[PDB]
């Protein structure tokens, strides 16, 4: 049947997680975004010649709520852990969100991507950040907020990750 990939995005409220979802789902017509519609976070996309739908669940604005994410993660098929390179607080919270989704899943090799967003005031280095992703046995991709670089990469690489998981039985 028709495949549907469900990806969850985590990070602290200020990493511009919203900017990543909008830039991916909407290209030249980002202005025509309606936040209330049922279609709002669903895109019919061609992944590797295969026709497939994607759903993106973003905790934008809802980061202070206590229990709600537990059900977002359970069950979401894909996971994108986003941090801002310029700050230390959001990169430190990566550890909190990492165990948080594992506290809901018993899967070490669950589809995952560690990503840095937003260089003039970059406090973090690409050496100390890579020393956390590959230690979690997970690929690392550097993204830019407004330039539209590695935007499609992170949503396509993760969709393949769950395509690989859906095959495994």
């Amino acid at each position: 049947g028709p495949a549907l990939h469900k990806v969850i995005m985590v990070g602290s409220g200020g990493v511009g997680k919203s900017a990543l979802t909008l830039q991916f789902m909407y290209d030249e017509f980002v202005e025509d975004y309606e936040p209330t519609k049922a279609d709002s976070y669903r895109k019919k996309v061609v992944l590797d010649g295969e026709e497939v739908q994607i759903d993106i669940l973003d905790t934008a604005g809802q980061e202070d709520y206590a229990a709600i994410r537990d059900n977002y993660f359970r069950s979401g098929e894909g996971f994108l852990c986003v941090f801002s390179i310029t700050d230390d607080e959001s990169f430190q919270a990566t550890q909190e969100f990492r165990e948080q989704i594992l506290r809901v899943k018993n899967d070490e090799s669950i589809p995952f991507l560690l990503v840095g967003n937003k260089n003039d005031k970059r406090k973090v280095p690409l050496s100390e950040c890579q020393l956390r992703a590959q230690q979690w046995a997970v690929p690392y991709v550097e993204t830019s907020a407004k330039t539209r670089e590695n935007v499609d990469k992170v949503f396509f690489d993760l969709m393949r990750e769950i395509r690989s998981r859906k095959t495994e039985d």
């Binding site: 200020g14 919203s18 909008l22 519609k37 049922a38 604005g61 709520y65 206590a66 229990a67 537990d70």
Partner: protein, 419 residues
């Protein structure tokens, strides 16, 4: 058929749209095409000229309420009041007919502004209020006097949940949620304010929104705390006192909160419904398979039905749509605020505040207002509640200490170890 084109003025861009409709009587002349002339973008000064134009009410109908509800994202209340006064005093040398027109509009605008956003007016606007007061006395303008009057005028056992009737519990939680939702200042929910909450220097930003979230978290905490035999002592992951509880006893606590949640659903306190439901779906409670096993099927059906209501499926369509024994129980509503905060943060990132020329992108403000406007009317609905504090349930609620996530994960593993 619709004709649409753009026009420009002083320091603003306008889009004019004219929609011709077919007549009532199929043989009658064409009705005059519905005209619409909306400000698209402009400088602050131009917005105020458009706000104090007599045509605006009838043409660009949503401009006035949109501007008043969203102006704190690109201005301050004192300044906007200042510009209205700036433009009025500038029309003192004008022909006396045009001054009388604009003054009338100014009164109208400022009345509506005071009526729908009263917390905008305080000590900060004293000078602007004096200027208007003096303006009205100089110009000989003859409710004018009404407007001036109204402007001047500005440790609890978590297991004791069982000891109270669920409908009473729901009433009591609604009371706390209703007052906080009434105290909500919608402009604080704007993406450009709420989205920047975590930035250093923004710790006291949006206090009315935070209180809404804190109350949500107490309820979620209450549920989690209550289902576990758990009472929090300190911040430490081992600083918890646990009541011993058999699985059928723990099931009764689960069924208790399910009934509470259902009663909140009856009262249309959707915020608390989602707090209870989330807590019962959270990892340290979802793990308790033995406890859920002792739960009545009737209770599980209700619970499943409550969960479907607040699913993320199709952009929360099921919870978004719901908004659109007892004596004299007034009708109210308390929405889950998160969904609104998500929309506004998302909407904040979809548009730049300013255009390349430096104009205020009012397009963004209209979209923001579509959400702000909706929760403004839900506040009006929320006033239809009529409930009274029950001091014992209240007292039980305040002495209630939520666990940390590390405390709840640890306890869950103690009371029901993994097989």
């Amino acid at each position: 058929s619709v004709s649409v084109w753009d026009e420009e003025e002083d320091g603003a861009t306008f889009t004019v749209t004219s929609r011709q409709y077919r007549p009532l009587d199929p043989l009658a002349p064409l009705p005059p095409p519905r005209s619409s002339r909306r400000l698209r973008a402009g400088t602050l000064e131009a917005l105020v000229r458009h706000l104090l134009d007599a045509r605006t009410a009838g043409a660009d109908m949503m401009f006035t309420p949109a501007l008043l509800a969203t102006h704190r994202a690109f201005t301050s209340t004192p300044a906007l009041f200042g510009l209205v006064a700036d433009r009025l005093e500038a029309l003192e040398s004008y022909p006396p007919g045009e001054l009388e027109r604009t003054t009338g509009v100014a009164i109208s605008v400022l009345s509506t502004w005071l009526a729908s956003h009263p917390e905008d007016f305080g000590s900060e606007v004293k000078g602007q209020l004096d200027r208007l007061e003096s303006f009205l006395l100089r110009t000989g303008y003859a409710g004018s006097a009404d407007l001036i009057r109204n402007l001047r005028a500005r440790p609890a056992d978590p297991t004791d949940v069982l000891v109270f009737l669920a409908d009473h519990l729901a009433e009591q939680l609604t009371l706390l949620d209703a007052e906080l939702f009434l105290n909500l200042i919608p402009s604080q929910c704007l993406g450009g304010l709420w989205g920047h909450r975590d930035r250093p220097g923004h710790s006291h930003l949006c206090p009315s929104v935070r209180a809404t979230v804190t109350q949500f978290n107490k309820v979620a905490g209450a549920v989690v705390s209550s289902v576990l035999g758990a009472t929090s002592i300190g911040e430490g992951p081992r600083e918890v006192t646990v009541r011993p509880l058999r699985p059928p006893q723990r099931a009764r606590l689960l069924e208790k909160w399910i009934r509470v949640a259902e009663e909140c659903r009856l009262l249309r306190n959707f915020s608390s419904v989602y707090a209870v439901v989330s807590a019962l779906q959270s990892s340290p409670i979802h793990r308790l398979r033995a406890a859920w096993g002792e739960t009545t099927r009737d209770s599980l059906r209700v619970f499943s039905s409550l969960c479907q209501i607040f699913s993320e499926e199709d952009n929360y369509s099921q919870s978004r749509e719901l908004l659109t024994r007892s004596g004299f129980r007034g009708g109210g509503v308390v929405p889950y605020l998160g969904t609104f905060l998500k929309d506004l943060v998302m909407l904040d990132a979809a548009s730049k505040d300013e255009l390349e020329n430096g104009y205020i992108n009012f397009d963004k403000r209209r979209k923001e207002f579509a959400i702000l406007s909706e929760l403004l009317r839900l506040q009006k609905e929320c006033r239809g509640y009529d409930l009274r504090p029950n001091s014992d349930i209240q007292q039980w609620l305040q002495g209630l200490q939520p666990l940390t996530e590390a405390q709840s994960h640890r306890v869950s593993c103690e009371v029901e170890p993994p097989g």
